[PDB]
Design an enzyme around this catalytic site. Structure first.
Site, PDB file in Angstrom:
ATOM      1  CB  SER A  46      -0.934   0.028   1.207  1.00  0.00           C
ATOM      2  OG  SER A  46      -1.976  -0.925   1.069  1.00  0.00           O
ATOM      3  CE  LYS A  49      -3.911   1.175  -1.104  1.00  0.00           C
ATOM      4  NZ  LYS A  49      -4.241   0.219  -0.017  1.00  0.00           N
ATOM      5  CB  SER A 106      -4.073   1.582   3.787  1.00  0.00           C
ATOM      6  OG  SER A 106      -3.034   1.170   2.927  1.00  0.00           O
ATOM      7  CD  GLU A 144      -6.244  -8.571  -8.876  1.00  0.00           C
ATOM      8  OE1 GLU A 144      -6.241  -7.327  -8.733  1.00  0.00           O
ATOM      9  OE2 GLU A 144      -7.297  -9.218  -9.057  1.00  0.00           O
ATOM     10  CB  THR A 211       1.903   1.815   6.626  1.00  0.00           C
ATOM     11  OG1 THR A 211       0.510   2.109   6.483  1.00  0.00           O
ATOM     12  CG2 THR A 211       2.413   2.528   7.855  1.00  0.00           C
ATOM     13  CB  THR A 213       0.518  -4.442   5.519  1.00  0.00           C
ATOM     14  OG1 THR A 213       0.958  -3.450   6.451  1.00  0.00           O
ATOM     15  CG2 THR A 213       0.621  -5.806   6.193  1.00  0.00           C
TER      16      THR A 213
HETATM   17  B1  RM9 Z   1      -2.058  -2.148   2.031  1.00  0.00           B
HETATM   18  O1  RM9 Z   1      -0.781  -2.671   1.890  1.00  0.00           O
HETATM   19  O2  RM9 Z   1      -2.109  -1.397   3.277  1.00  0.00           O
HETATM   20  C1  RM9 Z   1      -2.530  -2.117   4.400  1.00  0.00           C
HETATM   21  C2  RM9 Z   1      -3.463  -3.166   4.280  1.00  0.00           C
HETATM   22  C3  RM9 Z   1      -3.813  -3.847   5.444  1.00  0.00           C
HETATM   23  C4  RM9 Z   1      -3.267  -3.546   6.661  1.00  0.00           C
HETATM   24  C5  RM9 Z   1      -2.318  -2.522   6.788  1.00  0.00           C
HETATM   25  F1  RM9 Z   1      -1.798  -2.230   7.961  1.00  0.00           F
HETATM   26  C6  RM9 Z   1      -1.921  -1.763   5.632  1.00  0.00           C
HETATM   27  C7  RM9 Z   1      -0.875  -0.635   5.807  1.00  0.00           C
HETATM   28  O3  RM9 Z   1       0.210  -0.963   6.239  1.00  0.00           O
HETATM   29  O4  RM9 Z   1      -1.233   0.510   5.520  1.00  0.00           O
HETATM   30  C8  RM9 Z   1      -4.047  -3.385   2.927  1.00  0.00           C
HETATM   31  C9  RM9 Z   1      -4.782  -2.406   2.065  1.00  0.00           C
HETATM   32  C10 RM9 Z   1      -3.415  -2.783   1.727  1.00  0.00           C
END
Ligand code: RM9
Ligand code: QNA
Length: 270
Positions: A46, A49, A106, A144, A211, A213
């Site tokens: 993410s 973004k 996110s 994806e 961030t 994740t």
């Molecule tokens: B993304 O990589 O960002 C994200 C998700 C789920 C949990 C998270 F903590 C984070 C983040 O680190 O901002 C999903 C939507 C994507």
């Protein structure tokens, strides 16, 4: 010359984590840097973004009223992890609100809608090329793009390129002054980073971050601009991955790497 003047135990940290950590940190006053695996590719997850919102702000410089444009969307747009856009499904949100949601929560649906506005992953990539970033690539959409496959360059950048582009956008001249401060303000309001770079940054310093994740391959990350009081700001990026699909990511490892980066720059912190 000014790179890694003070060595830090990043190797021990990544070995304890069981994967790879990539770090690039820049003291914008002296130009001194801390660099560890800084030119390797890591999945963006993410973290793209933030750059997405910057690209929207760049477009808004030529499109008065873009940010105020109301965007309606159907339930088919609401992919998993869309915490803000799901609350406005029946009303719509503005482009600026979608940008803030993508940055600060996110929000996945918001990210896909904004990607469509820019012409897709190639359009965001083109924006990054226009600011001099030849490393960044976005290739796919949510969800994806989070596959984080070892060796796959799709949807990756390097810690160094992330930091260099973040500096240009938040502190340099890549955005006009009003849009630059709006980007900073969105990053400052991020809600998802309290256990990552921010956990290494004293509470009396200003900080904005984004961030990422991916959910697989121990892959997670954070980048930030940090304003220590009384000195020039620091820009830094911390990216992780790990060899096995079921390897877990670690927020504590990201915070610890950020601490080592600040220590390597001689920035007195916590
Ligand atoms: B993304 O990589 O960002 C994200 C998700 C789920 C949990 C998270 F903590 C984070 C983040 O680190 O901002 C999903 C939507 C994507
Ligand atoms: O879904 C969310 O993560 C979320 C959000 F993004 C903004 C505000 C709220 C949310 O949920 B909650 O903590 O249960 C609460 C009503 C508040």
């Amino acid at each position: 010359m000014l790179t890694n003047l003070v060595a830090e135990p990043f190797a021990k940290l990544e070995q304890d984590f069981g994967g790879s950590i990539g770090v690039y940190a820049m003291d914008t006053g002296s130009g001194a840097t801390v660099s560890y695996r800084a030119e390797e590719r890591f999945p963006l997850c993410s973290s793209f973004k933030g750059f997405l919102a910057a690209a929207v702000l760049a477009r808004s410089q030529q499109q008065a009223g873009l940010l105020d444009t109301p965007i309606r969307y159907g339930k088919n747009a609401l992919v998993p992890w869309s915490p803000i856009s799901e609350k406005y499904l029946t009303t719509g949100m503005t482009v600026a609100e979608l940008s803030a949601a993508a940055v600060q929560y996110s929000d996945n649906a918001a990210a896909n809608l904004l990607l469509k506005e820019l012409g897709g992953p190639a359009g965001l990539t083109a924006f990054m090329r226009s600011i001099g970033d030849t490393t960044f690539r976005l290739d796919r959409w949510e969800l994806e793009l989070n596959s984080a496959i070892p060796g796959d360059a799709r949807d990756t950048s390097s810690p160094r390129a992330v930091t260099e582009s973040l500096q240009k956008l938040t502190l340099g001249s890549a955005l006009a002054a009003p849009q630059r401060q709006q980007f900073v303000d969105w990053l400052k309001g991020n809600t998802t980073g309290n256990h990552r770079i921010r956990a290494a940054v004293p509470a009396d310093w200003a900080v904005g971050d984004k961030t990422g994740t991916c959910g697989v391959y121990g892959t997670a990350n954070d980048y930030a601009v940090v304003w220590p009081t009384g000195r020039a700001p620091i820009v830094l990026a911390v990216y992780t991955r790990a060899p096995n699909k079921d390897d877990k990511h670690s927020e504590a490892v990201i915070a610890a790497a950020a601490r080592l980066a600040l220590e390597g720059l001689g920035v007195n912190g916590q």
